[PDB]
Design a protein around this ligand. Structure first.
Ligand code: SF4
Lengths: 64, 92
């Protein structure tokens, strides 16, 4: 069951630029477990990275 | 089975930077069996305890991420089993 984040470099989901994070967010859109990944990352309060097609910051979504 | 876990864990850690994998190995005692404090790791690398704290937090997040963690799904006491339980919590 291919997940988009099994494609390319894992560090794409922890990119050092806004443009890099936008690419990772776009990869997640077609993920078959996207909403489950988002829910679980919120529960764990992931400190950074793209999870469920959203950017995390100290367990919060960067929405703007 | 346990040797295959050790091999797979090594392969996942080898996808991190030397510094990233080094902080995780020293924190969990993966090489020498002795977990090290953020303080001890700062002294070894000549980096602030605060930067080591940030690296540990950010790297554990990378290791939970399915991009790195998926392969480990198939798989207490040992450093390897403790790292597994820090990545997967209850799923161990
Ligand atoms: S939603 Fe989660 S699992 Fe799916 S591609 Fe994005 S990060 Fe990977």
């Amino acid at each position: 069951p291919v997940l988009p984040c099994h494609v390319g470099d894992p560090d794409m989901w922890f990119a050092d630029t806004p443009a890099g994070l936008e690419v990772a967010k776009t990869m997640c859109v077609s993920c078959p477990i996207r909403r489950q990944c988002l829910a679980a990352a919120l529960q764990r309060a992931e400190p950074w990275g793209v999870w469920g097609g959203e950017i995390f910051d100290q367990g919060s979504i960067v929405s703007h | 089975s346990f040797t295959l876990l050790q091999d797979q864990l090594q392969s996942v850690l080898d996808t991190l930077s030397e510094r990233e994998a080094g902080v995780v190995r020293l924190r969990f005692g993966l090489t020498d069996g002795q977990p090290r404090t953020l303080d001890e790791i700062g002294q070894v690398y000549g980096v602030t305890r605060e930067r080591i704290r940030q690296i540990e937090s950010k790297t554990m997040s990378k290791l939970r991420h399915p991009s790195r963690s998926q392969v480990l799904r198939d798989y207490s006491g040992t450093p390897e089993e403790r790292l597994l339980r820090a990545i997967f919590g209850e799923k161990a």
